[PDB]
């Protein structure tokens, strides 16, 4: 199975430029992104997919800014990036699921944001 360098949670404020939810596989072996599939889930919905065999990314309308850096995928980095407008409306637990042929794995990360009272 795929193993991860885990992070329980990440927090952002309006001081952050981009929201980054980390996901790092420590034992990737594929030498070509065609054999890789990445899926990020939020509240039981697929909110980002990278399908290596089609070389295609898919996001729903409520995560239009979501993406991963495909150039970092063979190193195991499947971190999700998004803008603050998408991030603030979707706080909570995200699941990063990576598949490399018969080897798969998932990890959960909580995206946190705190409303500042003044």
């Amino acid at each position, epitope marked *: 199975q795929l193993l991860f360098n885990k992070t329980k949670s990440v927090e952002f404020t309006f001081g952050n430029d981009t929201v980054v939810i980390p996901c790092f596989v420590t034992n990737m072996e594929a030498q070509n992104t065609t054999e890789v*599939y990445v899926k990020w889930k939020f509240k039981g919905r697929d909110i980002y997919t990278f399908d290596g065999a*089609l070389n295609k990314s898919t996001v729903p309308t409520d995560f239009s800014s979501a993406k991963i850096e495909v150039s970092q995928l063979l190193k195991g980095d499947a971190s999700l990036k998004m803008d603050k407008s998408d991030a603030v409306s979707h706080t909570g637990n995200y699941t990063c699921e990576v598949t490399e042929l*018969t080897r*798969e794995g998932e990890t959960i990360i909580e995206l946190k944001y705190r409303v500042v009272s003044w």
Partner: antibody
Amino acid sequence: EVQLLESGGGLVQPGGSLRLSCAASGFTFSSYAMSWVRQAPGKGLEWVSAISGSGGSTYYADSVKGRFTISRDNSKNTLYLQMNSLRAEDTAVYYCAKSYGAFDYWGQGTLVTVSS
Amino acid sequence: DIQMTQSPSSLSASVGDRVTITCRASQSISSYLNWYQQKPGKAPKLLIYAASSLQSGVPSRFSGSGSGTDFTLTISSLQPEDFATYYCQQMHPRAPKTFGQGTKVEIKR
């Protein structure tokens, strides 16, 4: 060695319910997705259900969606299939299998016969 | 969903013959395809995973090839104990990981 021990099959009346069990051993159960595949008499293999290692994601074939529920108890290393509203077309040998993809290990199979 | 077209439906081949079975996927799935051998009323056994890797314990006379949409299972030199129905299976995570129709391999004698 890896073992997948099935139980809970057998004769059941049309419209009835059954709960299949699959006691796994020889591999880290919680690290893998698990599946159920069936074979009706004189028919091919039909994948029917799958569940992620944690149990957070479930998958079903359209032929069983709404009637079957897959679940797992990682503390007991056991996989379940709750089958409700059974019909004559659900008569098949049911197998549990390790993974949801390349099924490397399989249970022995248990015949489920939907008959009065 | 992804549909697999497995061919032929059945074949009869002599002991020592090469057996060739093919599977075509309706979409490009890179190496996400597996092959199984199934004896009647018994659990299938995984032969080839990820289109071209031999599963440990499987005899070297079995091999798989192909990537994308066109896949082939070969038995290089058929042994009498190799009679079975063989199945391809798509396993790309974009769709249900379903089996092909199967090919019944009979021993000609």
